[PDB]
Design a binder for this molecule. Structure first.
Ligand SMILES: OC[C@H]1O[C@H](O[C@H]2[C@@H](O)[C@H](O)[C@@H](CO)O[C@@H]2O)[C@@H](O)[C@@H](O)[C@@H]1O
Ligand SMILES: [Ca+2]
Ligand SMILES: [Cl-]
Ligand SMILES: [Cl-]
Ligand SMILES: [Cl-]
Ligand SMILES: [Cl-]
Ligand SMILES: [Cl-]
Length: 251
């Protein structure tokens, strides 16, 4: 907690919601609050909700831990659609990508609970990452097949114990880990390198329901600064002007 950045975190009872204090997040769309959780959508159809951090993040090296809960009463496979976690240029704009805008700038981590793709080769729920410069559209009907950078299957729905995600970004390495099995352990999901993201973007979370639904709750988001060396050469460039992109190792 020494490196907890409170201004980039969402922690109960949620600052400024139930008091005269100033809030640290904007609550948008279907989102509602209780003293115990932020609920982005209820288990009802055609909802879109988001939360957006007030201040841009200027940390070069960070790790976000998200305590979330996806749960509902839909029978068999009749539930959806999932949660998106954002580190993006823009904030507050609703849209078709789990409740937030398409053609975004920055990083998305999708926790997709419904296979829209009739010819999918993936097992759901499926957690994936996407990096965008404004040009790409998330093809919702194909579960973002064409724009997936990396991903993993993850059993996070309707669990009897707390479920957590970690997203770590430092020196181009993007790692996503899960804690879904009540083992107090981070299990790898995604670990990739060559990911270029600027400082000055906003953390956000969103969720959407369509003809299928689920409760999509965020209990906390805790952002930690990683103490990572950058040389005077590395430090001098303007990190706010980095264009979101990915460098790829050749075959
Ligand atoms: O029918 C209203 C609903 O339509 C669209 O959602 C569709 C699809 O994208 C969803 O994955 C599934 C499962 O929830 O539902 C629909 O078939 C969207 O336009 C959505 O916003 C809307 O509520
Ligand atoms: Ca889907
Ligand atoms: Cl808060
Ligand atoms: Cl409904
Ligand atoms: Cl569809
Ligand atoms: Cl369980
Ligand atoms: Cl896990």
């Amino acid at each position: 907690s020494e490196h907890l950045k409170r201004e980039h975190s969402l922690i109960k009872p949620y600052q400024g919601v139930g008091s005269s204090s100033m809030p640290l997040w904007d609550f948008q769309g279907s989102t509602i609050l209780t003293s115990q959780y932020v609920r982005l959508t209820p288990d009802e159809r055609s909802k879109e909700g988001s939360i957006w951090n007030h201040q841009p993040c200027f940390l070069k090296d960070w790790e976000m831990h998200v305590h979330f809960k996806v749960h509902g009463t839909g029978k068999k496979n009749l539930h959806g659609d999932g949660i998106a976690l954002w580190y993006t240029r823009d904030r507050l704009v609703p849209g078709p990508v789990f409740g937030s805008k398409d053609n975004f700038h920055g990083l998305a981590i999708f926790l997709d609970t419904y296979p829209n793709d009739e010819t999918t080769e993936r097992v759901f729920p499926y957690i994936s990452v996407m990096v965008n410069n404004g040009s790409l559209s998330y093809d919702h009907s194909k579960d973002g097949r064409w724009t997936e950078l990396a991903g993993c299957t993850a059993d996070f729905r309707n669990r009897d114990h707390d479920t957590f995600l970690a997203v770590r970004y430092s020196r181009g390495r993007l790692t996503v880990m899960t804690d879904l099995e009540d083992k107090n352990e981070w299990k790898n999901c995604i670990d990739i390198t060559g990911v270029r993201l600027p400082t000055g973007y906003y953390f956000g979370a969103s969720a959407g329901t369509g003809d299928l639904s689920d409760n999509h709750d965020i209990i906390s988001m805790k952002l930690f600064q990683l103490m990572v060396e950058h040389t005077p050469d590395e430090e001098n460039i303007d990190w706010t002007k980095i264009e979101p992109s990915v460098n790829f190792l050749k075959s």
